[PDB]
Symmetry: D2
Subunit: 120 residues, 4 copies
């Protein structure tokens, strides 16, 4: 909970500001250093509030809808990954970015990638 | 908002109960008809509250952490897709399921699939 | 081998013409009914030539580089899925389409989707 | 073609031995440093033999069916990514691993990840 709460940065220089609730909630803001996006976007998600004690990571995910007071890309990213604690704590994610499309372009609606978040 | 709020079922017979907030919030419960899961799990997500008017779908996503009062799979799914309105309304998604793992099994942490939700 | 060899069509009306070799090879041509593509493109892949006998599908995959004598999209799709035999035989796939990009756009290089191939 | 042909290693210590044909063919062997696998497995794939000259990567992909003379995992991985030339040449991929399953487990058939291959 303390492990997760705070400010994370990924390999692109994006900024992930999250609070982890005792009830498994993730709340905060995301700022992308790339694409048609600016300023902060609301995020919400979930994480495993009672993780395995066997040295496994803590599963979590979250969503950003790329609508704020500045821009609307008509799109949503979800990140699915795990928090790894210790010396150099990481969130290792894979993400799906779905654009809103016509049924004609639905085949090309979704980008896939991977982001690694660190504290520094 | 009305379009999205309610009870959806996917091709597996899973049950997705969501409220769409005027502010872009998605809140509700998920019940999987498959895997090591039972009863309802909390979900949260986001959707584009001001979608394009050009016949495009409405981008959205959401997260479930597979922890409730019955089971803890130490895992999280995110669904990323779009709501398509009209006669037979659909949510078309792709999803990432991340297990918590040791760094040794991190390569095999994430399942990927696709779910289609309908109202019936 | 007989199961797989022949002409398949996906939900988009694309045409997948494949021969399965006794040695696990997949060879043929792909024709996309969508995107910046025309005519046939070479495909190669692999499949499990000795599948489980327990009613499981047969794992397989294949690649198309979107270069032929007509167009070069500077991109490659791989499909990963399984052949399901019987009355209505299917190839159920998920696919990754990677464009060639600058390191600046590498984050947006890859589309993800799902295709279902049938014989009809 | 020269750029691609040779021996690559990913972050797991797996060994990707490939020849790039003038006609866009990729042929070779894969050895996984992880999972239920041993020794070399046949791979085939495709790459863009006439890439953009604007500093973009070269799109490519390839398939391994996890059957050789030692083991049969009844599964196939496809890697989709791009070759980046220059000082520290890379193949940056995302991959889909499909197991053969019953229709009952088809939802959990596919793992997704990302591998980075370097020359050293």
């Amino acid at each position: 909970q303390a492990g997760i709460t705070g400010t994370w940065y990924n390999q692109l220089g994006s900024t992930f500001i999250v609070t982890a609730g005792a009830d498994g909630a993730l709340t905060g803001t995301y700022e992308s250093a790339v694409g048609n996006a600016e300023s902060r976007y609301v995020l919400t998600g979930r994480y495993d509030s009672a993780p395995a004690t066997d040295g496994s990571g803590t599963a979590l995910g979250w969503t950003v809808a790329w609508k704020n007071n500045y821009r609307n890309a008509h799109s949503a990213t979800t990140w699915s990954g795990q928090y790894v604690g210790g010396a150099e704590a990481r969130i290792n994610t894979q993400w799906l970015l779905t654009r809103g499309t016509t049924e004609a372009n639905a085949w090309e609606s979704t980008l896939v990638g991977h982001d690694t978040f660190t504290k520094v």
